[PDB]
Design a protein around this ligand. Structure first.
Ligand SMILES: [Cl-]
Ligand SMILES: [Cl-]
Ligand SMILES: [Cl-]
Ligand SMILES: [Cl-]
Ligand SMILES: [Cl-]
Ligand SMILES: [Cl-]
Ligand SMILES: [Mg+2]
Ligand SMILES: [Mg+2]
Ligand SMILES: [Mg+2]
Ligand SMILES: [Mg+2]
Length: 263
């Protein structure tokens, strides 16, 4: 809706940074609204959904087991690993790692899952095979959050990842069991949801993943809608701002508030 565009623009002005935005109809994939839809932005932790989609694709193919136990060491632990830092001695299952990576944004969990699939290039290959010609993962956590000016590594476009998310959450790319699992992880309650869950009406569905990185990078991918069912995909990204984190969050939250008001 045009009012959401005005709020996207205002966020650019307040944040001193580009903002990319797209809204898709979930059933048809129709573009309902867009701003800078084909510009590149860092994925940051939004990639963790794509990663767990690749894991689930392997589970469906009989190449991975959700109950397989992964053992790791102290040196594997990187910053912002609130779950994996509690399992050095006992390990974690693949299932547990995806839950941590998505719901807790656990960085080491994502690195371990990247090992399970064979690394960033294997994630990128999976994306190419499902028809995403843009998204790329090049590095692991935390390096992928760098947000360096003029660096194409670890980026997507709003349009690309919106379509990829739709593929993962609907249709037959994943089995029903695996779709539902991916949804369940993305819908689970989390500690703080400033970007969209703070705007979301009661009784609405949301399955989301946020991301934050260096150099102003911030984003969210989501499927949401009224009546306990998703009806739209929304993707919001920004990078480059040096405004406070609270201001970044607030500006993105206001885009969501607009989306909801003019739904
Ligand atoms: Cl545009
Ligand atoms: Cl564009
Ligand atoms: Cl492995
Ligand atoms: Cl699409
Ligand atoms: Cl959030
Ligand atoms: Cl700050
Ligand atoms: Mg200002
Ligand atoms: Mg060991
Ligand atoms: Mg091309
Ligand atoms: Mg809930």
């Amino acid at each position: 809706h045009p009012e959401t565009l005005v709020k996207v623009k205002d966020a650019e002005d307040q944040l001193g940074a580009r903002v990319g935005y797209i809204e898709l109809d979930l059933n048809s994939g129709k573009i309902l609204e867009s701003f800078r839809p084909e510009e590149r932005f860092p994925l940051t932790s939004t990639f963790k959904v794509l990663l767990c989609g690749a894991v689930l694709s392997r589970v469906d193919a009989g190449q991975e087991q959700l109950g397989r136990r992964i053992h790791y060491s102290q040196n594997d632990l990187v910053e912002y690993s609130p779950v994996t830092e509690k399992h050095l001695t006992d390990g974690m299952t693949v299932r547990e790692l995806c839950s941590a990576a998505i719901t807790m944004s656990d960085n080491t969990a994502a690195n371990l899952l990247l090992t399970t699939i064979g690394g960033p290039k294997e994630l990128t290959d999976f994306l190419r095979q499902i028809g995403d010609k843009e998204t790329r993962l090049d590095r692991i956590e935390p390096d992928l959050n760098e947000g360096k000016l003029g660096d194409l590594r670890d980026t997507t476009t709003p349009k690309a990842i919106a379509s990829t998310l739709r593929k993962l959450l609907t249709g037959e790319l994943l089995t029903l069991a695996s779709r539902q699992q991916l949804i369940d992880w993305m819908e689970a309650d989390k500690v703080a949801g400033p970007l969209l869950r703070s705007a979301l009406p009661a009784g609405w569905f949301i399955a989301d993943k946020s991301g934050a990185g260096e150099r102003g990078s911030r984003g969210i991918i989501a499927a949401l809608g009224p009546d306990g069912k998703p009806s739209r995909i929304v993707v919001i990204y920004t990078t480059g701002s040096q405004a406070t984190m609270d201001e970044r969050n607030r500006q993105i939250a206001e885009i969501g508030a607009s989306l909801i008001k003019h739904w």
